[PDB]
Amino acid sequence: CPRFLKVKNWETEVVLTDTLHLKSTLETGCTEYICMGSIMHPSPEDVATKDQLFPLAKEFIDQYYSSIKRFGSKAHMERLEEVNKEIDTTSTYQLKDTELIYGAKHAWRNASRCVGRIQWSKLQVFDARDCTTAHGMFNYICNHVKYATNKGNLRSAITIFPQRTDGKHDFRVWNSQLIRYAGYKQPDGSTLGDPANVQFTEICIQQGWKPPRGRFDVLPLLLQANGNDPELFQIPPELVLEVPIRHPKFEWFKDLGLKWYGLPAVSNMLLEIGGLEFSACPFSGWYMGTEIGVRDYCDNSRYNILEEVAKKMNLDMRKTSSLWKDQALVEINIAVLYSFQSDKVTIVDHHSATESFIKHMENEYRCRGGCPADWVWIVPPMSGSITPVFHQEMLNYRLTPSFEYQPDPWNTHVWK
Amino acid sequence: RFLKVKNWETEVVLTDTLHLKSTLETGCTEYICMGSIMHPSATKDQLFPLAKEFIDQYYSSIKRFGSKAHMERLEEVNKEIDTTSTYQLKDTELIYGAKHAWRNASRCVGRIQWSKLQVFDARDCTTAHGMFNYICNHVKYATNKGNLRSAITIFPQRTDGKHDFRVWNSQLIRYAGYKQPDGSTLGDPANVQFTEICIQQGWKPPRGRFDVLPLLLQANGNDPELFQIPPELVLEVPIRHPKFEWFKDLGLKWYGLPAVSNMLLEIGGLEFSACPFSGWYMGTEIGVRDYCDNSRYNILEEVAKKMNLDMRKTSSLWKDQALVEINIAVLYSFQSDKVTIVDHHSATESFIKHMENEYRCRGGCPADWVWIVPPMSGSITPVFHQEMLNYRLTPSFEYQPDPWNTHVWK
Numbered sequence: 003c004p005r006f007l008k009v010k011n012w013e014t015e016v017v018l019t020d021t022l023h024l025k026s027t028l029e030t031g032c033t034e035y036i037c038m039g040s041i042m043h044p045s046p047e048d049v050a051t052k053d054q055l056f057p058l059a060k061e062f063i064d065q066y067y068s069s070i071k072r073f074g075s076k077a078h079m080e081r082l083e084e085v086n087k088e089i090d091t092t093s094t095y096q097l098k099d100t101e102l103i104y105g106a107k108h109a110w111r112n113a114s115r116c117v118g119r120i121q122w123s124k125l126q127v128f129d130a131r132d133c134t135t136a137h138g139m140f141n142y143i144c145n146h147v148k149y150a151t152n153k154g155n156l157r158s159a160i161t162i163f164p165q166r167t168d169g170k171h172d173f174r175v176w177n178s179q180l181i182r183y184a185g186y187k188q189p190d191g192s193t194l195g196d197p198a199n200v201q202f203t204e205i206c207i208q209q210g211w212k213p214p215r216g217r218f219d220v221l222p223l224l225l226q227a228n229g230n231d232p233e234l235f236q237i238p239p240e241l242v243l244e245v246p247i248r249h250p251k252f253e254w255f256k257d258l259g260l261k262w263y264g265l266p267a268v269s270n271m272l273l274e275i276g277g278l279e280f281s282a283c284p285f286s287g288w289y290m291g292t293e294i295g296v297r298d299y300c301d302n303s304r305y306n307i308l309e310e311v312a313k314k315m316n317l318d319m320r321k322t323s324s325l326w327k328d329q330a331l332v333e334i335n336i337a338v339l340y341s342f343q344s345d346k347v348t349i350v351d352h353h354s355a356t357e358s359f360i361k362h363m364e365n366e367y368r369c370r371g372g373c374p375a376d377w378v379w380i381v382p383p384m385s386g387s388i389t390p391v392f393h394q395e396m397l398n399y400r401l402t403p404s405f406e407y408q409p410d411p412w413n414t415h416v417w418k
Numbered sequence: 419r420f421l422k423v424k425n426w427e428t429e430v431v432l433t434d435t436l437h438l439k440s441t442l443e444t445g446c447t448e449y450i451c452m453g454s455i456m457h458p459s460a461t462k463d464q465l466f467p468l469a470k471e472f473i474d475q476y477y478s479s480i481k482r483f484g485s486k487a488h489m490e491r492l493e494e495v496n497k498e499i500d501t502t503s504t505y506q507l508k509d510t511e512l513i514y515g516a517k518h519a520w521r522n523a524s525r526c527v528g529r530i531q532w533s534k535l536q537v538f539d540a541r542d543c544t545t546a547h548g549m550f551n552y553i554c555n556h557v558k559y560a561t562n563k564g565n566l567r568s569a570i571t572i573f574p575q576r577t578d579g580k581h582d583f584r585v586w587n588s589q590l591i592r593y594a595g596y597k598q599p600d601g602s603t604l605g606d607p608a609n610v611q612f613t614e615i616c617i618q619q620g621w622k623p624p625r626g627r628f629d630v631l632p633l634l635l636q637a638n639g640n641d642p643e644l645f646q647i648p649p650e651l652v653l654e655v656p657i658r659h660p661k662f663e664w665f666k667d668l669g670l671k672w673y674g675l676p677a678v679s680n681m682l683l684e685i686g687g688l689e690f691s692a693c694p695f696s697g698w699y700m701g702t703e704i705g706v707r708d709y710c711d712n713s714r715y716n717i718l719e720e721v722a723k724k725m726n727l728d729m730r731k732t733s734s735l736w737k738d739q740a741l742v743e744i745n746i747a748v749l750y751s752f753q754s755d756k757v758t759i760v761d762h763h764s765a766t767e768s769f770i771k772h773m774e775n776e777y778r779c780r781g782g783c784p785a786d787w788v789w790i791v792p793p794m795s796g797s798i799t800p801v802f803h804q805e806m807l808n809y810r811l812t813p814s815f816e817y818q819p820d821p822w823n824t825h826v827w828k
């Protein structure tokens with residue numbers, strides 16, 4: 003690979019120079035002859051051997067001690083030796099609290115699909131590696147939700163549960179996000195609530211959940227500790243902050259009966275630090291408006307409200323070239339931003355978020371030598387080219403520490 | 419190395435085998451993806467395998483692979499490369515190659531039309547006047563009083579690089595841009611430099627906001643020469659709005675004919691440095707990019723003004739609101755004037771159908787998601803949810819250096 007790669011911004015002519023890609027550790031899926039950049043998941047029961055672990059841990063320890071300006075120091079060399087001995091006698095090792103916090107923040111810093119990374123160094127890390135049971139995981143998650151929600155002044159946070167050992171004792175949050183609404187398939191084929199969550203909702207009902215069978219039922223937590231069968235818990239409703247959606251101009255918009263939860267909290271990803279694997283690491287931030295207003299509400303396979311809103315706006319819905327869909331989509335995103343700001347719940351519009359991200363990316367290029375970014379994910383799902391990231395060339399590559407996808411736990415779990 | 423592509427909205431999975439036939443590079447590697455980079459990084463010896471590859475897929479396409487005609491053509495091409503260091507395509511091959519360069523353009527959402535392409539052979543052209551005549555004929559044919567027809571005009575191929583045919587205009591029809599004294603810009607700011615070359619070469623600019631630029635045509639590597647396209651051949655549309663009667667007062671118009679004139683067509687190793695090609699517009703090309711890019715006509719603030727929108731906070735989405743009304747106007751205007759145009763909903767829908775057609779009959783369809791997804795309302799169009807594999811097949815349309823950076827002025 004060449005040492006310097008240039009990216010251009012075609013609106014501002016600004017050229018940036020990337021050297022950080024030389025530290026790339028994993029494959030992207032692309033080859034010299036094919037690009038897989040719009041494949042969502044490009045290409046087990048298998049843990050790192052001693053020989054796989056030694057270099058992965060050294061690389062991370064080296065990076066950590068470089069970051070604290072102690073590279074080559076006595077503490078650096080001693081930490082290397084202690085880690086090496088630990089791997090040698092136990093085939094794994096335990097991170098220091100300092101190292102865990104650094105690794106978590108850097109997995110966020112390295113997350114190429116995240117437009118909100120200007121915040122990466124302001125992350126509250128909750129060390130839950132002493133957890134042994136699902137009830138304990140419930141306690142940790144509740145504290146996380148309460149801390150991160152903060153009565154609407156949201157704060158980013160991650161709670162990290164014990165790392166993988168042999169792969170038969172995994173900690174998992176079976177929920178894909180901590181807070182989501184149930185979906186219910188009807189006999190007649192229609193769906194009530196969130197159609198994306200019909201499968202998981204069915205799992206919870208089989209596990210014992212009594213469903214309200216409404217349009218916005220918060221799902222219970224399904225929590226697996228130490229490889230045991232998962233267990234159900236209801237999140238105390240006073241910890242689930244929600245925003246009813248109204249429109250500043252259209253008095254009828256509240257009559258739609260829409261609301262959404264304030265806290266986006268991903269709970270199905272895997273956090274990889276120095277070759278260690280944290281299979282339960284729920285992390286949360288605050289929303290960009292389009293995540294709710296474009297995808298959650300207007301995806302055809304989700305709540306799918308464009309028609310109903312277009313009807314109440316009295317739009318001509320016979321020709322697509324009237325752009326009735328586009329007009330309604332804007333008003334829905336105006337309502338979402340307006341309802342969150344009125345209730346003083348942190349949210350960020352896609353103009354402000356992408357402008358912030360360009361500033362972040364430029365700083366990272368200057369101070370770090372690059373900033374991996376996935377353009378397909380960074381550009382918002384509406385009004386793409388009137389945001390600055392549309393015009394920004396990006397380079398995508400995989401740095402470690404990192405958040406990874408992992409198989410859904412109901413597909414792998416060995417029921418006791 | 420059968421590759422699967424999924425649509426996350428419909429769950430349709432298609433299987434790609436066609437990528438096994440590519441040999442040009444993408445710019446990515448196993449460790450770095452350059453999918454959002456706009457431009458990532460002959461002789462007798464290089465030429466015959468490239469020619470043989472192209473003749474092979476041609477005769478494979480008419481289902482006479484290994485036929486007597488096929489065998490004879492290969493030998494004919496061999497001797498011609500021997501004795502002349504190049505070769506000439508048959509008319510059938512020229513047409514096949516041009517349609518297939520369009521078919522293979524990963525960045526084109528309009529490829530469902532790929533085989534309906536009128537191909538104008540201009541390989542006998544020798545002068546800029548002849549180029550002008552061929553180009554006027556293309557424009558007139560393609561415009562067709564509003565019922566636009568896809569066309570391409572193919573001028574003589576590159577020989578030694580010192581006798582290149584070039585259209586110096588990036589597109590056949592564009593508006594001029596002028597650097598104003600007070601620092602601002604009149605017209606189209608994307609063209610300020612090309613406009614200045616035309617002025618330097620003798621063009622008398624009217625210094626308005628929608629001045630159609632003259633043609634600047636270079637034949638056989640000579641100095642380029644200026645020509646005015648006859649105005650009756652340049653179809654234009656006044657943009658107005660079905661509900662906002664004040665919109666016509668903005669004074670906006672656009673031309674009906676999108677015609678790329680700065681790319682290079684490669685076919686069996688031959689390079690056609692002048693190959694103007696044209697189709698019809700997707701509304702967002704004018705309404706989102708041309709009118710609302712900050713570095714282009716940049717009209718958003720004005721439109722939002724007349725709409726009386728709250729422009730103090732970005733979270734009012736005033737820009738998004740104005741953007742939709744502008745794009746409603748463009749579609750409404752072209753449609754009212756019976757000028758062929760397609761909205762991004764209909765176009766992307768056609769492209770998904772095209773992808774399905776191509777996977778079935780051809781085993782795949784190279785597509786660049788970054789370019790295929792429209793610049794507004796992305797995820798309410800079906801291509802947003804469609805995984806695409808990008809790879810480079812030949813014949814192809816390639817970028818080439820701008821002629822003013824290479825030409826030695828004679």
Ligand code: HEM
Nearest residue numbers: 110113115116117118121158159285286287288289290405
């Ligand atoms: C603090 C405010 C944050 C904002 C505004 C933000 C914004 C976003 C958005 C809009 C996406 C695209 C999501 C989608 O389309 O599904 C995303 C993805 C992502 N974010 Fe951030 N995020 C924030 C916080 C965080 C934090 C705290 C972490 C981790 C510690 C994180 C890690 C990620 C990752 C890994 C992805 C990729 C997810 C995937 O591939 O499914 N983000 N973010």
Ligand code: HEM
Nearest residue numbers: 520523525526527528531568569695696697698699700815
């Ligand atoms: C017939 C109607 C057509 C429609 C609606 C259409 C639509 C589009 C659009 C929207 C783009 C993106 C352009 C941009 O953002 O600058 C594009 C790109 C492209 N089109 Fe098509 N197109 C059509 C016809 C054609 C024809 C006739 C050809 C050639 C024979 C062609 C070849 C290409 C190529 C090579 C590109 C890529 C240009 C680049 O990389 O800058 N298209 N098309």
Ligand SMILES: Cc1cc(N)nc(CCc2cc(CC[C@H]3CCCN3C)cc(F)c2F)c1
Nearest residue numbers: 179182266267268285286287288289290293
């Ligand atoms: C920390 C953080 C901040 C922030 N602004 N957004 C996020 C993502 C939030 C999020 C993500 C998903 C998965 C979407 C997946 C599944 C289906 C299609 N997509 C690929 C579901 C949710 F409910 C949700 F809230 C995280």
Ligand SMILES: Cc1cc(N)nc(CCc2cc(CC[C@H]3CCCN3C)cc(F)c2F)c1
Nearest residue numbers: 589592676677678695696697698699700703
């Ligand atoms: C055959 C065909 C059909 C169709 N609907 N559209 C096209 C493209 C039309 C087109 C393209 C450009 C270049 C824009 C530049 C600016 C920066 C990045 N882009 C490369 C200028 C134009 F005036 C123009 F009409 C071709």
Ligand SMILES: C[C@H](O)[C@H](O)[C@H]1CNc2nc(N)[nH]c(=O)c2N1
Nearest residue numbers: 392393394395454455456788789
């Ligand atoms: C940086 C990025 O590659 C660049 O802005 C691209 C993005 N996608 C595009 N898509 C289309 N159709 N046309 C364009 O000019 C661009 N520009």
Ligand SMILES: C[C@H](O)[C@H](O)[C@H]1CNc2nc(N)[nH]c(=O)c2N1
Nearest residue numbers: 040041042378379802803804805
């Ligand atoms: C097929 C395509 O990769 C898929 O729809 C992607 C496109 N870009 C995205 N971008 C974001 N932020 N979130 C998404 O879910 C997607 N989906």
Ligand SMILES: [Zn+2]
Nearest residue numbers: 032037446451
């Ligand atoms: Zn790639």
